Amino acid sequence: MQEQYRPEEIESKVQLHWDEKRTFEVTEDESKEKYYCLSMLPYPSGRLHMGHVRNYTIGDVIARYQRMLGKNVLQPIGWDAFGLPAEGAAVKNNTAPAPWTYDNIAYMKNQLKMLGFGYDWSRELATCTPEYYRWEQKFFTELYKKGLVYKKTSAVEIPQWFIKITAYADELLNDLDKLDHWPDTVKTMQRNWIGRSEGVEITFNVNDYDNTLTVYTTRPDTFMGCTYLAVAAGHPLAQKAAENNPELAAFIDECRNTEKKGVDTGFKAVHPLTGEEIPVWAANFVLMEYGTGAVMAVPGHDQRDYEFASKYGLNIKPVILAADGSEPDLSQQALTEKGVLFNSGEFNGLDHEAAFNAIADKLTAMGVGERKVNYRLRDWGVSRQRYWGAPIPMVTLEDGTVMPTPDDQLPVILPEDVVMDGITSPIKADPEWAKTTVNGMPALRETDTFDTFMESSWYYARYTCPQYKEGMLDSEAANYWLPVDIYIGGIEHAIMHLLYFRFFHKLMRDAGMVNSDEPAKQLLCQGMVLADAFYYVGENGERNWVSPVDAIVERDEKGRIVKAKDAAGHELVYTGMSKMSKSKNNGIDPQVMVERYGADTVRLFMMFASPADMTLEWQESGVEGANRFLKRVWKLVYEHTAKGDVAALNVDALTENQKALRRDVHKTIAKVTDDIGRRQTFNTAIAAIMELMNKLAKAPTDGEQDRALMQEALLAVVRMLNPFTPHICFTLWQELKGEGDIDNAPWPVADEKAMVEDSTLVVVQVNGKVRAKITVPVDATEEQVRERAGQEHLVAKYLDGVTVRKVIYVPGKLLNLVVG
RNA sequence: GCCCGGAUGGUGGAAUCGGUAGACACAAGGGGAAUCCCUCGGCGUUCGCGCUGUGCGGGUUCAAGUCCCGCUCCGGGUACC
Ligand SMILES: [Mg+2]
Ligand SMILES: [Mg+2]
Ligand SMILES: [Mg+2]
């Protein structure tokens, strides 16, 4: 065993071992319990950032841990390889998106391997390859045939392909209740995004107008407070008035281009319940695309109605009582909360629900209103006018008819060998490309490409069967691996990717491809990585941001930063810990830290510094701390093994001191197990390891028994660290002569006999304040404990000439003397 | 505007059915570039501890960081639906 811990001489060798033995390659083995650990796949931008490194270390800890529990563990990696940044970079260099993307993939793959992530590399997928994307093309034609796909022109105004995500709104919404191991925050974000709303449509007669106008409201209870209506710029009534009104027409034209603003339509509606004529405005805040593109306005109780009404001198009418039953102060703003009606005729005194229902019922029976459920969720627009994405498998015949690309022309291959002219997709600018023949007649194949969210919506599934032809999924394999047991990635994907992949899963279920409703049991959103951020003010008044690496700080007598400078001598202002970024120049390159300290130190720091789901504060000093710890583990194993083999441990003949150390070993095992497997607090797991290492470093190692005990502890410690720092642990395991490769060694289980106490610490309070802590035989009786407490000078001091009124006793733990 | 989080030493961050607050680590200063034995919330100390202490106020309980009421401050999403 080398005396010196040398990451550079260890890490690449173990890594090569992992590849040579294919250690982390798995099959669909029905005789084992499966566990699918998934991290969100990276975009091949060029290098890993610190967030990839946190995301994938978390995944790797879990995958290696679960393997040591004896599970069959799938941990796959791949590349979300289509998308915009490649087009930018293709043009910026003298190049094409594909070769730039493949270069980034090789470079980043080598970084992942240098970090020693235990992936099943045989399952590796890159989404820009025809072998991957042909399947989403095929599935898209199937989706179209199921009636879930349609073309339509829309804002972004351009034609687009949509997939009917609204056909699954209620399922996406209901099934959120099945997801207890998703965080509330992500669930609430998807709820609001889907935005199912229960309301009322209300129809008005309009003077000098040969239609009726209908609005949608979620607060029909406030309808007696309605003083005007507001319609979207692009509403048929708004257009009918503009015909004779240059002001209005001017306004409508504005509302397309680049904040309460509107115009008086000149039309008057009759309020169906008061008979009063009310104005109709065109207004900027009203979406033509939602509901009916028109609202009834109630300034007294809708904040945006309040602002609009004030601006244009429209009536503000109160109809909701305050929470305390008093008529609302509307001098400043609207009363938003739902309360009892007043000033609403027949509906006065009704509470919120009763009023909602009475007014709905009334307007229904009058035939000018009905209940109506709307959704904020729009259909999913999957089309882009972009080159670097998977072609959309549709064609147009000469007769005009749109249909899917015939099965025998799939995939539709994106040509990789192209030259970007910056502005037009090569497959657009060459009018030859589109030309095809369908049933031996000329057709034009679609020229738009898929939204990149298309590939990331089903990759997690394809990982189960990456080499399968015949179909998108081999069901047997997919149903074996799915659902994902834990999915680790950022909360920022909450209402894009994390919604799309639930939807796509349901689409694949409903094509018979899988047999479960939800793609992922647990979702873990890891916190952001923060770093210190500094800037100075140039003599031009411009803020110049200086990397915290480049900052020379100086500290008071307690270590607070109080003054700082860069090398050039500028005065820096410390702005605290902040999200890593190019704007603030506080990015840290993981590769530099891997090359400086070895991957194990980097990984250990990032798991130690902070619970997975909280923000992590990057500190060079914490990293050097982690590194020194690893040297202390290396040293203690060096010293222990330098003395050769050990006798078998005799557990019956241990000193009270030995029993105590061994109890601490096994309690640590229990605690680390609980922390990693149930609580998922990896920071406290690691702290328990360090704490134990500190004790082990202080224990004697001369006697045969001390050495046997040290062997047992080191074999446990080395396994406990292994999911965090597997390169050093793999090596140390061999030094200790552990059986086999550590990657397939069993996770240590705590020995119950080792955890038994002969003694217990009893905390002694007097009137609830700690006056002593006594060690007593583990089964001492309450009388024995009391007697011992009263023999303590520290306690007796507070019993002297005062009377014990009563005692509270928690067996073997606490005695409080109430006195007196 | 809501939706949660949160607030504990000089800093990060513990405390898992209320029962030894501050584990673990960093900074820092100090003793014997790298290493080990310490010390370390505050005040006081006869070194045994005493008082005080988890954002402020109050309640509950023999006992509150942890439960309940009310403040004050703060981070991060996110809206004309
Ligand atoms: Mg924690
Ligand atoms: Mg504080
Ligand atoms: Mg506790």
> Where would I find the beta strands (DSSP E) of A210-301?
212-217, 228-232, 262-270, 277-283, 294-297
Task: Give helix A590-597 / helix A50-68 axis angle, nearest 10°.
Answer: 60
Could you give the C-alpha distances from A503 to A492, A499, A506, A519, A536, in angstroms and in order? 18, 6, 5, 9, 48
How far from chain centre, in Å, is Cα A557?
A: 40
Q: Is A142 exposed, middle or buried (0-12, 13-18, 19+ CB in 10 A)?
A: middle
How many A from CA of A670 to the centre of ligand 3?
A: 18
Torsion (CA) A796, A799, A800, A803 in degrees, nearest 10: -160
Nearest to A37 by CA among A490, A522, A454, A527: A522
Nucleotide nearest to A185 (CA to C1'): B4
The string of DSSP letters for A556-578 reads -TT--EEEEE-TT-PEEEEEEEE
**A423, amino acid identity:** I
CA A557 to CA A270: how far, in whole Å? 76
With tokens 């994938």, the residue in question is A56
For residues A59 and A24, the answer to whether their CB atoms sit within 8 Å is: no
Q: A422: phi > 0 → left, psi -120 to 50 → alpha, else beta; which?
A: left
- State, as a whole number of angstroms, the distance between the CA of A136 and the C1' of B6: 43
Other CB atoms within 10 A of residue A415 CB? 13
A748 and A780 both lie in a single domain: no
Other CB atoms within 10 A of residue A190 CB? 21
Nearest to A778 by CA among A753, A751, A811: A811
Q: If you measure CA to C1', which residue is closest to nucleotide B49?
A: A794
For residue A654, what are its two tokens?
């241990």
CA A35 to CA A67: how far, in whole Å? 8
According to DSSP, residue A391 is labeled B
Beta strands across the sheet bearing A380-381:
A149-154, A158-163, A380-381
- State, as a whole number of angstroms, the distance between the CA of A336 and the C1' of B78: 19
Q: If you measure CA to C1', which residue is closest to nucleotide B15?
A: A684
Note the strand B nucleotides within 7 A of protein beta carbons. Answer: 2-4, 10-16, 19-21, 23-29, 34-38, 48-51, 62-64, 77-78, 80-81
Q: Are strands A814-819 and A484-488 parallel, antiparallel or unpaired?
A: unpaired
- State, as a whole number of angstroms, the distance between the CA of A572 and the C1' of B6: 29
CATH number at residue A123: 3.40.50.620
For residues A458 and A472, the answer to whether their CB atoms sit within 8 Å is: yes
Q: Is the peptide bond before A442 cis (omega within 30 degrees of 0)?
A: no
Could you give the C-alpha distances from A369 to A212, A331, A341, A366, in angstroms and in order? 12, 32, 20, 7
Q: How many helices, marked H, and strands, marked E, lie in chain A?
A: 26, 32
CA A490 to CA A306: how far, in whole Å? 38
How many A from CA of A529 to the centre of ligand 2?
A: 22
Q: If you measure CA to C1', which residue is closest to nucleotide B23?
A: A687
A301 and A395 both lie in a single domain: no
Long-range contacts formed by A322-329: CB under 8 A, 24+ apart = A328/A300
For residue A183, what are its two tokens?
């965080």
3-class DSSP state of A200: strand
- State, as a whole number of angstroms, the distance between the CA of A390 and the C1' of B59: 65
For residues A451 and A496, the answer to whether their CB atoms sit within 8 Å is: no
3-class DSSP state of A1: coil
Task: Give helix A590-597 / helix A599-608 axis angle, nearest 10°.
Answer: 120
CA A330 to CA A236: how far, in whole Å? 33
- Count: domains in chain A: 5
CA A18 to CA A154: how far, in whole Å? 51
- State, as a whole number of angstroms, the distance between the CA of A787 and the C1' of B27: 46
Other CB atoms within 10 A of residue A694 CB? 11
How many A from CA of A9 to the centre of ligand 3?
A: 44
Which run of H or of E encompasses A286? none
Q: If you measure CA to C1', which residue is closest to nucleotide B77?
A: A492
CA A208 to CA A268: how far, in whole Å? 8
How many A from CA of A487 to the centre of ligand 1?
A: 20
Could you give the C-alpha distances from A82 to A6, A246, A449, in angstroms and in order? 39, 48, 10
CATH number at residue A776: 3.10.20.590
A415 and A525 both lie in a single domain: yes
Instruction: Give φ, ψ of A356 to 5 degrees.
Output: -40, -60
Nearest to A168 by CA among A571, A507, A564, A456: A507
Task: Give helix A726-735 / helix A704-721 axis angle, nearest 10°.
Answer: 150
A291 and A421 both lie in a single domain: no
For residues A738 and A715, the answer to whether their CB atoms sit within 8 Å is: yes
Q: Is A10 exposed, middle or buried (0-12, 13-18, 19+ CB in 10 A)?
A: buried
**A626, amino acid identity:** A
Instruction: Give φ, ψ of A164 to 5 degrees.
Output: -75, 75
Task: Give helix A599-608 / helix A620-641 axis angle, nearest 10°.
Answer: 120
CA A719 to CA A712: how far, in whole Å? 11
Nucleotide nearest to A197 (CA to C1'): B81
Instruction: Give φ, ψ of A685 to 5 degrees.
Output: -65, -45
Nucleotide nearest to A614 (CA to C1'): B5
For residues A73 and A79, the answer to whether their CB atoms sit within 8 Å is: no
- Alpha-helical (H) ranges within A22-80 are 50-68
Nucleotide nearest to A629 (CA to C1'): B25
- State, as a whole number of angstroms, the distance between the CA of A769 and the C1' of B21: 13
How far from chain centre, in Å, is Cα A76?
A: 18
Q: Return the half-sphere exposure (C-beta side, CA atoms, 13 A cut-off) of residue A725.
A: 30
Instruction: Give the Cα-Cα-Cα angle A613, A181, A44 (nearest 5 degrees).
Output: 55
Q: SS3 letters for A452-484?
A: CHHHHCCHHHHCCCCCCCCCCCCHHHHHHHCCE
CA A382 to CA A781: how far, in whole Å? 73
**A488, amino acid identity:** I
CA A316 to CA A330: how far, in whole Å? 9
How many A from CA of A558 to the centre of ligand 2?
A: 15
How many A from CA of A460 to the centre of ligand 3?
A: 40
Last residue of a domain, one of A338, A359, A374: A374
Non-local CB neighbours of A339 within 8 Å, separated by 6+ positions: A320, A321, A322, A323, A351, A352
How far from chain centre, in Å, is Cα A766?
A: 49
With tokens 């244009």, the residue in question is A312
> Where would I find the beta strands (DSSP E) of A398-438?
402-404, 435-437
Other CB atoms within 10 A of residue A369 CB? 25
A413 and A513 both lie in a single domain: yes
Q: Are strands A769-777 and A759-766 parallel, antiparallel or unpaired?
A: antiparallel
CATH number at residue A545: 2.20.28.290
Count of all residues that appear for chain A in the document: 820
> Where would I find the beta strands (DSSP E) of A149-288?
149-154, 158-163, 197-206, 212-217, 228-232, 262-270, 277-283
For residue A167, what are its two tokens?
């056909």
CATH number at residue A636: 1.10.730.10
CA A225 to CA A71: how far, in whole Å? 64
How far from chain centre, in Å, is Cα A142?
A: 31
Nucleotide nearest to A692 (CA to C1'): B24
Last residue of a domain, one of A487, A512, A530: A530
- State, as a whole number of angstroms, the distance between the CA of A768 and the C1' of B68: 21
> Where would I find the beta strands (DSSP E) of A345-433?
369-374, 380-381, 383-384, 394-397, 402-404
Q: If you measure CA to C1', which residue is closest to nucleotide B34?
A: A628
Torsion (CA) A554, A557, A562, A563 in degrees, nearest 10: -30
CA A762 to CA A321: how far, in whole Å? 59
For residues A262 and A283, the answer to whether their CB atoms sit within 8 Å is: yes
C-alpha gyration radius of chain A: 35
Nucleotide nearest to A218 (CA to C1'): B81
Beta strands across the sheet bearing A769-777:
A769-777, A759-766, A814-819, A804-810
For residues A610 and A684, the answer to whether their CB atoms sit within 8 Å is: no
With tokens 């100086």, the residue in question is A554
Could you give the C-alpha distances from A314 to A218, A336, A451, in angstroms and in order? 22, 18, 45
CA A222 to CA A225: how far, in whole Å? 6
The string of DSSP letters for A123-168 reads G-EETTSHHHHHHHHHHHHHHHHTT-EEEEEE---EEEEEE-GGGG
Instruction: Give the Cα-Cα-Cα angle A713, A715, A718 (nearest 5 degrees).
Output: 105
How far from chain centre, in Å, is Cα A679?
A: 18
How many A from CA of A585 to the centre of ligand 1?
A: 29
Burial A663-674 (b: 16+ CB within 10 A, else e): bbbbebbbbbbe
Q: Are strands A484-488 and A520-524 parallel, antiparallel or unpaired?
A: parallel
According to DSSP, residue A738 is labeled -
CA A262 to CA A278: how far, in whole Å? 16
Method: X-ray
Q: A400: phi > 0 → left, psi -120 to 50 → alpha, else beta; which?
A: left
A59 and A186 both lie in a single domain: yes
Instruction: Give φ, ψ of A268 to 5 degrees.
Output: -120, 130
For residue A18, what are its two tokens?
């992992």
A566 and A592 both lie in a single domain: no
Nearest to A183 by CA among A593, A434, A526: A526
How many A from CA of A560 to the centre of ligand 2?
A: 14
Torsion (CA) A772, A773, A775, A778 in degrees, nearest 10: 120
CATH number at residue A285: 3.90.740.10
Which run of H or of E encompasses A696? helix A682-698
Task: Give helix A11-21 / helix A726-735 axis angle, nearest 10°.
Answer: 90
Nucleotide nearest to A623 (CA to C1'): B26
CA A309 to CA A315: how far, in whole Å? 7
CA A744 to CA A723: how far, in whole Å? 12
> Where would I find the beta strands (DSSP E) of A332-399?
369-374, 380-381, 383-384, 394-397
* Residue positions forming the annotated binding site of A: 582
Q: If you measure CA to C1', which residue is closest to nucleotide B78?
A: A189
- State, as a whole number of angstroms, the distance between the CA of A791 and the C1' of B51: 24
Other CB atoms within 10 A of residue A499 CB? 22
CA A271 to CA A226: how far, in whole Å? 8
CA A273 to CA A366: how far, in whole Å? 10
Q: Which residues pair with A232 in a beta bridge?
A: A283
**A83, amino acid identity:** G
CA A329 to CA A333: how far, in whole Å? 8
A748 and A623 both lie in a single domain: yes
A211 and A354 both lie in a single domain: yes
For residues A118 and A64, the answer to whether their CB atoms sit within 8 Å is: yes
According to DSSP, residue A42 is labeled P
**A652, amino acid identity:** D
A382 and A364 both lie in a single domain: no
CA A677 to CA A694: how far, in whole Å? 24
For residue A121, what are its two tokens?
């590399």
Nearest to A689 by CA among A663, A669, A707: A669
Which run of H or of E encompasses A234? none
Nearest to A699 by CA among A689, A707, A690: A707
Q: Which ligand is nearest to the CA of A688?
A: 1
A547 and A515 both lie in a single domain: no
**A721, amino acid identity:** L
- State, as a whole number of angstroms, the distance between the CA of A770 and the C1' of B53: 15
* Residue positions forming the annotated binding site of A for ATP: 582
How far from chain centre, in Å, is Cα A474?
A: 28
Torsion (CA) A256, A257, A262, A266 in degrees, nearest 10: -50
3-class DSSP state of A369: strand
Nearest to A548 by CA among A521, A574, A525: A574
CA A744 to CA A740: how far, in whole Å? 7
- State, as a whole number of angstroms, the distance between the CA of A666 and the C1' of B72: 46
Q: Return the half-sphere exposure (C-beta side, CA atoms, 13 A cut-off) of residue A668.
A: 28
Q: Which residues pair with A402 in a beta bridge?
A: A396
3-class DSSP state of A553: strand
Other CB atoms within 10 A of residue A393 CB? 25
Instruction: Give the Cα-Cα-Cα angle A601, A603, A606 (nearest 5 degrees).
Output: 105
CA A286 to CA A309: how far, in whole Å? 14
Nearest to A199 by CA among A176, A177, A222, A175: A222
- State, as a whole number of angstroms, the distance between the CA of A609 and the C1' of B55: 25
Domain that holds residue A247: 196-374
Q: If you measure CA to C1', which residue is closest to nucleotide B4?
A: A185
Nearest to A603 by CA among A2, A20, A77, A59: A59
Q: Which residues pair with A574 in a beta bridge?
A: A534
Nucleotide nearest to A579 (CA to C1'): B76
Could you give the C-alpha distances from A43 to A74, A80, A377, A416, A455, in angstroms and in order? 21, 5, 27, 18, 12
- State, as a whole number of angstroms, the distance between the CA of A614 and the C1' of B71: 27
How many A from CA of A58 to the centre of ligand 3?
A: 27
How many A from CA of A549 to the centre of ligand 2?
A: 27
> What sign does the dihedral A344-A349-A351-A356 (CA atoms) show?
negative
Nearest to A392 by CA among A127, A87, A141, A86: A141
Which run of H or of E encompasses A106? helix A97-114
3-class DSSP state of A645: coil
Last residue of a domain, one of A564, A585, A606: A585
A790 and A704 both lie in a single domain: no
How many A from CA of A182 to the centre of ligand 3?
A: 26
Nucleotide nearest to A771 (CA to C1'): B49
For residues A171 and A506, the answer to whether their CB atoms sit within 8 Å is: yes
Could you give the C-alpha distances from A671 to A611, A679, A720, A755, in angstroms and in order? 16, 10, 11, 12
Which run of H or of E encompasses A16? helix A11-21
How many A from CA of A757 to the centre of ligand 3?
A: 21
Other CB atoms within 10 A of residue A95 CB? 15
Q: Which ligand is nearest to the CA of A527?
A: 1
For residue A71, what are its two tokens?
């599970």
